[PDB]
Amino acid sequence: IYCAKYRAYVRSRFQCIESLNKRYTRLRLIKEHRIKMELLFDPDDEHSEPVHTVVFQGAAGIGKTILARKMMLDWASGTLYQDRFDYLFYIHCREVSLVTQRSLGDLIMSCCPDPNPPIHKIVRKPSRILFLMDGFDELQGAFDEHIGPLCTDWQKAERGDILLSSLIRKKLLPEASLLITTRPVALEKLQHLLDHPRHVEILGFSEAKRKEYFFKYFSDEAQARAAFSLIQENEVLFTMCFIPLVCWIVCTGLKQQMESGKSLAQTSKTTTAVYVFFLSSLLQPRGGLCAHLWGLCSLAADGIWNQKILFEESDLRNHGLQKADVSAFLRMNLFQKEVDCEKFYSFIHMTFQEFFAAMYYLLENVPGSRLKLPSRENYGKFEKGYLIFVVRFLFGLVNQERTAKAKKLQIQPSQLELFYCLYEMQEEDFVQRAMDYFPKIEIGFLHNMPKEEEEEEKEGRHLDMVQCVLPSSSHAACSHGLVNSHLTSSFCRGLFSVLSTSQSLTELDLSDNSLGDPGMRVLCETLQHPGCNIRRLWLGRCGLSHECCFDISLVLSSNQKLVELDLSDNALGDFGIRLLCVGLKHLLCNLKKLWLVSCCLTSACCQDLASVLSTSHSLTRLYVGENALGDSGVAILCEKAKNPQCNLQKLGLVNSGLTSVCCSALSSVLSTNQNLTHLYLRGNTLGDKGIKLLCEGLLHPDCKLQVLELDNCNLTSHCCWDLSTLLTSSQSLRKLSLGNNDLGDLGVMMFCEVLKQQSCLLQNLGLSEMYFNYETKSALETLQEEKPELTVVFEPSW
Template sequence: MLHAVIIELDYQKKYREHILEEYQVIEDRNARLGEYVSLDKRYTKLLIVKEHWQREEKEHEIITRGRKHAELMAHQTSLTTVSVLFDPDRNRESPRTVVLLGAAGIGKTMTARKIMLDWAAGKLYQKKFDYVFYINCRKINLVTAQQSMADLLLNNFPDGVRPTKEIFEKPEKLLFIIDGFDELNSVLSMEEVSLWSDPFEKKPVKTVLCSLLRKEVLQKSFLLITSRPTALEKLKQNLKFPCYAEIRGFSGDDRKEYFHKFFGDEKKATQAFNFVKENEMLFTMCFVPIVCWIICTVMKQQMERKEDLAQTSKTTTSVYLLFLTSLLTDHFTDSVQQSKTTLWKLCSLAADGILERKILFEEGDLKKHNLSLSTIHTLFLNKSIFQKDTECESVYSFIHLSFQEFFAALFYVLEEDEKTMKKSLSSKKDVNIRFLFGLLNKERLNDMEKKLHCKTSSAIKLDLLKWALRNCLNQLELFHCLYESQEEEFAKSAMDNFQEIRLEHIRLSTMDEIALSFCVKNCCSKQSLYLCNCTLGIGEREEGWIAKLRKWLFPLEPHCWCTLGSLLHHRHCPKAGLIHKPRCQWLQFCSV
């Protein structure tokens, strides 16, 4: 018996050493440099909020916006850390399933990889879990052969080593990290899948994953599942008694720390951070790690070229476009035509992938779009080796899903045949609408023609707006689209379609406030604004709430400031028709 324990401990040690080696470095996705950096040295702490909500509480709003009911946000949320996600909470036992939600590029995968690294290094969950396994949903999409639970975990082990039977004898000491649930191709429906409980029995991979999620196999094991909020409805149908947490991105101090880690040079980091901090929109956008990384990458390149940092833009679309033009300029200094051709092929690949709900591409997909492997690998696509059936196969993906969405939107802006755009919009919301609005900005179009030498057309802009209004794009999402466009006259024509702006049960982020402010400024004088049970930030006090309203929502004519004062200090203002009900935080603003 003692001999078996010693062997198992030795097995654990070797497994930890392998995980440590596999996860200690990450590829710096600045393809121009092609560097590998230490995950520990680059990773920056993220804000994580643990949610306590009941299923009947406005789930449709959670799904469509990725935000929770305002009252829950104000009273039932608290900042938490990865280390306590599986601790008992209130009168509840330790949750065995934790869902870590977050928007695109917010740091879900990086957090998952950091958990793997910290556990292997002995810094996290030491007494709780003997083994932590990482399951990549993106790679699962390519698995066609039947597999067992043990087969599914092979990527976690060194070559030639397989999970042993002893590992599964203590399921309560196992943690499975299922990363990117929203990237699964198949819809996991309870009616379609027959569950099973033997971790060594081979079944279709869909059955294996469903059985793990629904605790049919390894019932006492622990799960940490990362996903975009858009997949929440599908996910919760497959879970038993989950606990939810949400990654909110970087705080202000965390952003500063990230800049210093990225640049590795005190003077340059301070210069770049101070410039970004002075631009409130740009600084706000840096709460999303992927955007923060892009901004740092672009600014680092601008510093190396001794260019003016003021070129860095203030919308997500313009930042992505600046990053694109910067890399293309570096790689195709001698061939404008090669740059245009490569861009078109990438955009075509991205658009096909979005329409087919495909995020992993095989070499045949690349050849179909005439992409050169040697060229594109150093630009915007990641390459990974994947075991498919009995052979190894190379697969490719865009460096982030948001990049694929950006390139797909760009495909329709560059497309000379406008019927292509209309055909796409007449189907479902396959294309990222915010990127489309942003790319149709006159300055962006000029930049593309000047720097990328591509022909573009803004003729589809009105068609895009009509489509957005006709397909019931919610108001807040439309405001973000209009903000991305950065064209006031266009925003005014769009806002004329509304007699009132009504937002209910929403926690408005700073970017929400910026987008709302932009649209309110472009309303006509007869429109109304209703905010019901909305909060700004986490646990915002009333005075802070009011200050933000003054700053963001009412940059209007001077007489409106008096109206705002009446609103905040009196229950009723007959002149302007304003009502303030403190208990439900209902605000009604009518321009006078």
């Protein structure tokens, strides 16, 4: 009964904002965890069983609350809503934002009293009530929506504090939904407040949808073909027009200049430049106004510094300069007072207020903002992007921008806090000010951008969905950094053009992302040309396949810079290995280490790998470790160093099979081949035969060997005395480790007996996973310190 009345009221409320019914383009909604607003809130039992709440998140101005208004007017239009709900309540979090303890709020314009004692009777059985809380970043107070001291009752007729009610009726015993829209920065206040939420990130204006916006805005031939193309021909500002608010800025920032004509594409770089140019388009023909601008500036941000968001019928402005210029600002803004609908005044989207707050902190303690910073981000970003750009626009636009000496005293503290927030702080989700946007909007590119050449500290950023113009603008300027980025899948030259020019000092790793099918085939041209490039390289479990290999075989041949490459867990095992070995064997290469673990490989390729040691004297440490190869490669492993002077220091090896054949092959290389330091055998199903052939192999005098490991065995209680007597006979190894070996009390008894006099090894020993007795453990912990020739012994569990 009361449905249609305030349905018509909200129709009047959100119809008047601009229209905005033939001015609505549908947007993109993402939740990966690795959409449609129709049944968005499904608690369906795929992975979201008990949920009653979602949170919307995007950057500053993506269109969350205008999407909410579209939802309200849409259901207020009906629009095929099968009635999951009955009554929906927009809660503007910059009007309810006080602390001063009102009760439940559902009468807004103070009409006749609604049936409120039946308004919660229609919650309990019909759970068809929903409160769109919107604008969490400005729920004022003292940035204090913490864990509630005391709860409220589930009728709310008492005049409890909404700081202790909506927090509680959000938190506990709700039986009613809420879809809070916020910047993700203030998710943390909402995070440890327990919710069991869902999350949706909101991603808007693509190419074709921006085209539909420019058609639905203007008339279809005046400049909808002319301004669209004239803004299209810019290197930025089509990327920047992912944000719909910048589209609103330009379409009503040259609609006033279609009368003057032909000034459209100019001076358009950043998120700062669009705001400053739009403000110049409004505040042009009156500069009188030189005092009005400072009056608007000097009072715009005390509503967040002292936290009073709407300006309260501008009685604050009735203090500071209430004249007809207020009506002029209202008419040129067109959304200050009328959207408050009774008496109050506000800014349009309050990124304007954070922008004028940046003007405030120019023209009025910036370390106070520094300390208060991460509880919110827009004020710092906009003041930085304002700063070097008006240092540039000191000689650009007129000197109304600053009235300076306050400019340098916030750029040098800006790099000071940047140094402070990088060098001992990495926060990845919510504490910003360690992001490259704050240098990006700055570009003066000779000190203040290359000061982060010093404060970089071997970083690595995270490019999952950002337009890559920003980091490519950033790190190609500076000259340090052993960077490890992530997921440059779709876009291409924002990888190429910056990883080419890294010639001062660089390094790279793209591990565990998914480079696409020509993401294999990208980075060829990045690496196939000289200068200075990657020294060593890892590609851990990345998206790679066969088709890359010949490609990177060329970067095998063309490189005098590569020393270590890894293809781990990417299925490169057959016929791409032929391309890899002909690329390596083909030319002289300065390659010293190589890593080929866990790739789906077999014994049908190692015969090629025999040649590369014999030809190349530079390939030295071939960790081929424990990819799925087995027998019949074993004679090729023997011919890997039948000859001496192979120049092979280490050799990581593979989980192998039958003990006699592999260790008989290994005896020849461990006897004949000099300069072979390490040997990591592990996971090898071996018995007495293999270690017997091993100690017969090390019985060969003047065969040199460092550190060796044999892990998986169930050894007889005689081999330990044999090997330790061989090691007292000659310093044949230096250390040894043992793992899951059921070798018993008698083996370690013989071991501490032979270790009592003339400790055989000279570096280290390891025995793990042992449930044996303590009477010998006393001797193990005893005889290690007086003779520290055996330094460390692994103690198993106790």
